[PDB]
Design a protein around this ligand. Structure first.
Ligand code: 43B
Length: 181
């Protein structure tokens, strides 16, 4: 008997990773062929879920916790001889005190920095690794958690764009009340 999980989480590591990379100037990728059509009106077009949410939180994280993050990225020096263990360790402590969206996003970034550091050392080859190491920890040290707090749908409904605006809707309203009161 055996069993596994989904892949969504993994998609986050890739999508985000790329973002953290592009933000630094890097990128790298490839193309291919499949099969599809279209006939309406092409344009940027954007979503409004984990993708957008995750990113934002990431940028704001290093902003509010510029130090809390920096000091972290300096706690682990990824290398070819580095063992996935040395990784799951550092991330463990930062996650020792229970689990909360905050630490979650604050964590994701940790990895992003690792990649930025790898490329800086002309070792982008690592990116692929750290990327897999995350999807492994997120599915063995978070999955069970994220599924106990309403998955991501909740994270995007709390500390997310559509959510941010939603919050204001109320406030701007409440204030109007006391005023008319
Ligand atoms: O912010 C946090 N929590 S929150 O109140 O739930 C929150 C606060 C703000 C936001 N968003 C607004 C932007 S700020 C932000 C901050 C964090 C995440 C996302 C956003 C969000 N959120 O979006 O989910 C959540 C938060 C922020 C930082 C840390 C944090 C920082 C450094 C370290 S170093 C360490 C172990 C050391 C150690 C290292 C190695 C080896 C051994 C020991 N553990 C750490 C934990 C822990 C929690």
């Amino acid at each position: 008997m055996s069993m596994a999980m989904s892949q969504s989480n993994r998609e986050l590591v890739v999508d985000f990773l790329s973002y953290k990379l592009s933000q630094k100037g890097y990128s790298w990728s490839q193309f291919s062929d499949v099969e599809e059509n279209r006939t309406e009106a092409p344009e940027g077009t954007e979503s409004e879920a984990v993708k957008q949410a995750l990113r934002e939180a990431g940028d704001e994280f290093e902003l509010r916790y510029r130090r809390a993050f920096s000091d972290l990225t300096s706690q682990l020096h990824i290398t070819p001889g580095t063992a996935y263990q040395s990784f799951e360790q550092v991330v463990n402590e930062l996650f020792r005190d229970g689990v909360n969206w905050g630490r979650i996003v604050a964590f994701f970034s940790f990895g992003g920095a690792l990649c930025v550091e790898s490329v800086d050392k002309e070792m982008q080859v690592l990116v692929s690794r750290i990327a897999a190491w995350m999807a492994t920890y997120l599915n063995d040290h978070l999955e069970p958690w994220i599924q106990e707090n309403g998955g991501w749908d909740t994270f995007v409904e709390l500390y997310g764009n559509n959510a941010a605006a939603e919050s204001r809707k109320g406030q701007e309203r409440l204030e109007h009340h006391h005023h008319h009161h």
